[PDB]
Amino acid sequence: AAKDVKFGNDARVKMLRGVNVLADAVKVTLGPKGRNVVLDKSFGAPTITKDGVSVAREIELEDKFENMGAQMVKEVASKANAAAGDGTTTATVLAQAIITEGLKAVAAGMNPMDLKRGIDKAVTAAVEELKALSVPCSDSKAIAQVGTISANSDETVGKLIAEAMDKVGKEGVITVEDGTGLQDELDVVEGMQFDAGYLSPYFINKPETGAVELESPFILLADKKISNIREMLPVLEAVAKAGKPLLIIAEDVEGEALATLVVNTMRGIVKVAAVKAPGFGDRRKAMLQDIATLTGGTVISEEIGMELEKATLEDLGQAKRVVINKDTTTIIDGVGEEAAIQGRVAQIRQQIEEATSDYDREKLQERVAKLAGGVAVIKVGAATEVEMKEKKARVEDALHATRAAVEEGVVAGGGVALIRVASKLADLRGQNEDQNVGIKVALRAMEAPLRQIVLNCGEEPSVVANTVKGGDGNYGYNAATEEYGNMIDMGILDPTKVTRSALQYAASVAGLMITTECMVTDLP
Amino acid sequence: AAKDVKFGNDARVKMLRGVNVLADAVKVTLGPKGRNVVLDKSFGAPTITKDGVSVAREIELEDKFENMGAQMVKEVASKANAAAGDGTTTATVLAQAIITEGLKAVAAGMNPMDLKRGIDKAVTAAVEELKALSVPCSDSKAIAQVGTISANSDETVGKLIAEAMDKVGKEGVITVEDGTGLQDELDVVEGMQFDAGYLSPYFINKPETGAVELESPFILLADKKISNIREMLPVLEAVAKAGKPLLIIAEDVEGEALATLVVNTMRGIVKVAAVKAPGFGDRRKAMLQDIATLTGGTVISEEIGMELEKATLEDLGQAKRVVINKDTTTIIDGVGEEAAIQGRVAQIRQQIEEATSDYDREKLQERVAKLAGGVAVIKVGAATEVEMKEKKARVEDALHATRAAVEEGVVAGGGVALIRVASKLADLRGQNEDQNVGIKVALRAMEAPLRQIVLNCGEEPSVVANTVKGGDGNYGYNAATEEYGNMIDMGILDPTKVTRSALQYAASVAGLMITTECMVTDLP
Amino acid sequence: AAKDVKFGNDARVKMLRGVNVLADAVKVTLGPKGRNVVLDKSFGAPTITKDGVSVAREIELEDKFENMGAQMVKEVASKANAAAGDGTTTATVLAQAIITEGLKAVAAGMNPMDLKRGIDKAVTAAVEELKALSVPCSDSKAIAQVGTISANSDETVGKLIAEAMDKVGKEGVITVEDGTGLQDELDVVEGMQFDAGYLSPYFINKPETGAVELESPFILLADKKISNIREMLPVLEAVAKAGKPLLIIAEDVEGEALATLVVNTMRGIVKVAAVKAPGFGDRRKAMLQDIATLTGGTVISEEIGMELEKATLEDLGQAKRVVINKDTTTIIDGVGEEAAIQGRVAQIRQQIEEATSDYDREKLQERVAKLAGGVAVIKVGAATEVEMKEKKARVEDALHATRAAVEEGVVAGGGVALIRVASKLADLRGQNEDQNVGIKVALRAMEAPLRQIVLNCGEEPSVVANTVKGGDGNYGYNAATEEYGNMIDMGILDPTKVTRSALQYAASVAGLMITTECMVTDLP
């Protein structure tokens, strides 16, 4: 198909207009004072949201060149949200700031390559300052605080997350589900999560998360082999009755067992799943007995001399719910006895003094973390057909952001951290003047999040920004209460990874656009 | 698809314009002097109505931004009606008043967040003031009055509902169906209601009430779960041959069974509905047997050796009528014999004294209460197929509204309550002047219903509003007689829950619109 | 879909214009001097009619609001005609008169609800005056006069109906049907009429009259529900042979049997019609046997052990002609032997003295009437085929009006009755000036029919109307001869029911329109 082709300022004005439409719609939702955006649906009542992620998702423009501008910033803000677990709106706001001032610099006749070079220096320096400024979120109050803020200032979800981490630990397994109720609840059960992918993708019963979930299934294991389904027939029958879906994990299902198994999944008479299996050769024998011990099942191998034919209905392990993702598979609430599981822990704990290398004490300790750790499950319990599918996606991210806080720490929220970092970078310089202007472009942008938050309050960004800059450390503006004070004490905490990611992705796309001389698309 | 995006004033103006079209069309039907609105049908003759609910449902605008505004206020008003039983027109009048003045204030440049806080504060206080002003509906007279008003001053309706509730008791089952002749019929038959909904919303043949209406349906009671349609084949074919619909009650309906029971229900089934049997264990079995004895059906259990394919036409129960809501299933006039039914009730009572648990006594009680209770049936009299369906519409409405009156009590109608509450709030204040303006916005709006009623009479809203304000307590304007008096003595009563719910929902959407900076929709 | 929404004056002029197109097309055909209206057909020569009912049927307008106006008045005039058996044109004329003057009053700023109140009051008064003015229609001479006027001064039609009533009585059953050449026949035969409709409208072999007609059909009488066609199969094979169409009278026909027969009559090569037996309980089984005695057939019941599959050719009764409308079924000339029938009658007569309730005595009385009453068959002869059908249609029309004349009596035609009642209401007043204007609106409108009749003559409506007003009693204008005189002596008679209904229905829709503030319809 013949193409529409634009060059230079022509290309860039259209990108900028498209960026402007995207960012102007998204930025109004930033901070506790965010305005509402009405989003139309094909039929029925419109959706009304303060959520920048939902707003960005709907933006697409008629003009193709403008549209490319918007999709560029979207993709990049979307990557920040997936890496850090939050920051989409912040990343979008920053991107518009850098792009706008950057293109003014290009239009004045300044070297774009130098402009981009100075922006990058500023960002690399800004990222180090953030790492310096950061402080640990080690503590229940703080974790709850950060959770609450990633939760859109919802205490309950912040309380839940900090509650989960208390029981299962900071790096412990935590999963998000629906459940039945108008309110959200938390449960801590026996289960584990190891990295195994689906053997075939078509197992997936839920395309949204691209994962498989079976309800009250059975678990199978190897060992051997599995070359042929002929020995998979007898155990498939008994599982057919009782209406309980079957799960087969290990090990290395191949041939028609790998193939003819995936056929019956597409047809509605069967529900089955398979996984990439344990970390073997030798260690799989350890991992499997761990799974079997958790699921209350038995491990039947040909090595020992046992056959898959003799395997009975009770020979299988069991769990309440199972989830198999692309790279991962999780077991929720195994039915294995606690006396069994507990003794299996001690058996592995002896091997710690029995370990002749640092490499073994890692693995075996990773196993005791799976069995002894358990799995904390939170049920969103937002009651609606539409409200459920959504709130599960935000809490899933709110959990990701808290994890990010626990890893790389936290900094003063409300755009204060970026304001502070920019003040420290006041002396930073480039190789030439154009690189210098680039640097100042980045440093000006770092004020945009605070300014926008304030503007959404109906107060004057100039005055508040000035007042905050005139202060020190974690002093900031609390946009909920309209008062200044210590941001950390006030509990307004950004995960450092989130602030960091927002700026980096923002600056990425902005460098790209500032360095863009040509666009190609389809004819109108 | 590419989107049309508007911001700020340009957006709010279009939204307000769509609200005006909706409200101006709905509000002229308010009260006993309501004007007619003519609504077209693609075929046949136009519908002429004073019912705000019917007018609202038809409104959709060509301009997509205007339409979003209309749909926003519609949803909120129907949420109110769904919660309180009545008040759609009132809610819309209130929404228009709050939005209009609120938007005027925003255009003047006041802080929209503060405006919303002000409105919210006035409503919260108004709601309490309303609860205090409220009075219980104790007896048949006041109950009749409430029904009569919700019936558009039809005293025969109020009389019916008062008598229906007298027979079944104020806590108990009352349904309504088309009558065979000019006269009204009130009879109490054998029936029952438990809590289960439809498994899929597509089962709804009546979009207005969102309910599944099935006339002379066969009832399948299954003690198992159905994931597969192939075993439902011989049973269904028998049903499609008899020219009757089918209600499926089992453990669950899923897999291809559901999906097939959905699409096939659209054309060639030609009608079927299925609900999840309430409870579990021996309770779920015992409840199914209750339903079987009522409809003269036989429960299918796998443990007795019975199968679905061996199920004949006489293993299916039968009832005159069955209705299914999202949370509810109602079986009216089972064919089951007395002796089987009476033999059953004497059996559960015998289970009371044998029962060793106080919990079991209350649980077995709920079962005898349903079998011995039966269901009250109201058949709407005459006079023609279109007139009937309108009267059946009113009786249902009045039924809902009378409920609400029972729970939360009543207040003076004619918009007098909101007028009184407003005058009590004269001294209310906010944190700043903008919140004050918001409070005055809400208080001004609380005069909208009375004024509109008066305006529909062809009188002058200012003069009447003034006179009522100068009066005291339940003193008001009777718009039917155009005479002032005591609203309670004149039998003009609104359920407090209705007035409350209307103000709240209206204020909810208004606050949303006052705080909206951006709208996204499809291209024209 | 998006809607077009109009308000107030903008909405009302469009309704008015639509009413004007409908009314101006219909009203030119009023009375003996009515002008021709030409109605197109997709092929061949146009239809030329002086019949208002035919003109009104064809009117539909492009502008969707104008169309709404017209359909509203059509529905109402149509309702009048169905109730009283004539008056469509009169009602349409009255409706236009009230609407036109009423809207003039609205535009002047008068209270629309008061205007309606005033119109309503004058109408109920006029209805009482019509009842007072009404005179009995008893003698064959007055009856034939009534029939003649309904027939457009066809004195042959009036004579036929009068003759028919001289035999079966004034409440007797009368059917008209295609006769032999040129010569009318009237003969009373064994037969009856009960209320049952066609179960499938597709059964109709006469799309115009809207009724199914079976010639010398067999008649099946079954006391059970026919579901499976297989039970019905052998009884059909006997009907397939002998080439005698079948009439199935059963408790009901549904499912496989319904859809099976309904389609087979469409494809041709088969003739069948199904109707449900009237009443329920024991009264249903009695009336079935009634039809069985009349047709000389046998009732097939489940109780005595009679099987529908064992029903032989002699089990079925026979009629000469059978005519099934949507409302009623008529069996003409049953084959049942006189001794049979009259024995069944004396059996009922006995039970009439045995009745312990006056409900039975009325019901049993109804039956003997149908059995011993017989049916009058009017056979219309004509010079040509096309000349026969229209004369037949003239008789069917006049039959309706004649019955109405018999029930409620007669008044002076030519719109003199309405003129007289109006002059008598001159002092009538309402609660205020606006109500007074409404009354005058109605009173002025009552002159519209005479004026229009005179206008179709080509004379001056003011002069004739003024002269009639100047006289008393039944003095009026004869439009046929263009002379004044006594309307009753000249045989110009309106059934009081017709005049009353036309006025009532016209005032109904007129008040509705005078009170409409909003119209909602589809976009063009």
Ligand SMILES: Nc1ncnc2c1ncn2[C@@H]1O[C@H](COP(=O)(O)OP(=O)(O)O)[C@@H](O)[C@H]1O
């Ligand atoms: N009480 C508060 N005062 C000031 N800033 C706040 C407050 N609560 C949250 N914020 C800020 O709002 C920002 C998050 O806004 P949000 O609308 O979630 O955009 P994003 O999608 O980028 O997270 C963070 O920078 C956070 O510090």
Ligand SMILES: Nc1ncnc2c1ncn2[C@@H]1O[C@H](COP(=O)(O)OP(=O)(O)O)[C@@H](O)[C@H]1O
């Ligand atoms: N005789 C009356 N005098 C004054 N107000 C009345 C009278 N009858 C009903 N109303 C008022 O009409 C309102 C309900 O009117 P309606 O048109 O049904 O609107 P909605 O759909 O909001 O209930 C109530 O506020 C009630 O008090």
Ligand SMILES: Nc1ncnc2c1ncn2[C@@H]1O[C@H](COP(=O)(O)OP(=O)(O)O)[C@@H](O)[C@H]1O
């Ligand atoms: N010879 C006559 N002189 C005056 N009026 C007549 C005469 N014959 C019939 N009419 C009147 O014509 C009217 C019937 O009009 P028609 O054309 O049948 O329309 P509609 O459907 O209203 O009956 C009646 O009011 C009747 O009295």
Ligand SMILES: [Ca+2]
């Ligand atoms: Ca749309």
Ligand SMILES: [Ca+2]
């Ligand atoms: Ca610059």
Ligand SMILES: [Ca+2]
């Ligand atoms: Ca139409």
Ligand SMILES: [Ca+2]
């Ligand atoms: Ca104001």
Ligand SMILES: [Ca+2]
């Ligand atoms: Ca603003």
Ligand SMILES: [Ca+2]
């Ligand atoms: Ca002349």
Ligand SMILES: [K+]
């Ligand atoms: K937000």
Ligand SMILES: [K+]
């Ligand atoms: K109303």
Ligand SMILES: [K+]
């Ligand atoms: K302020």
Ligand SMILES: [K+]
């Ligand atoms: K005519």
Ligand SMILES: [Mg+2]
């Ligand atoms: Mg966030």
Ligand SMILES: [Mg+2]
């Ligand atoms: Mg109401």
Ligand SMILES: [Mg+2]
């Ligand atoms: Mg006529």
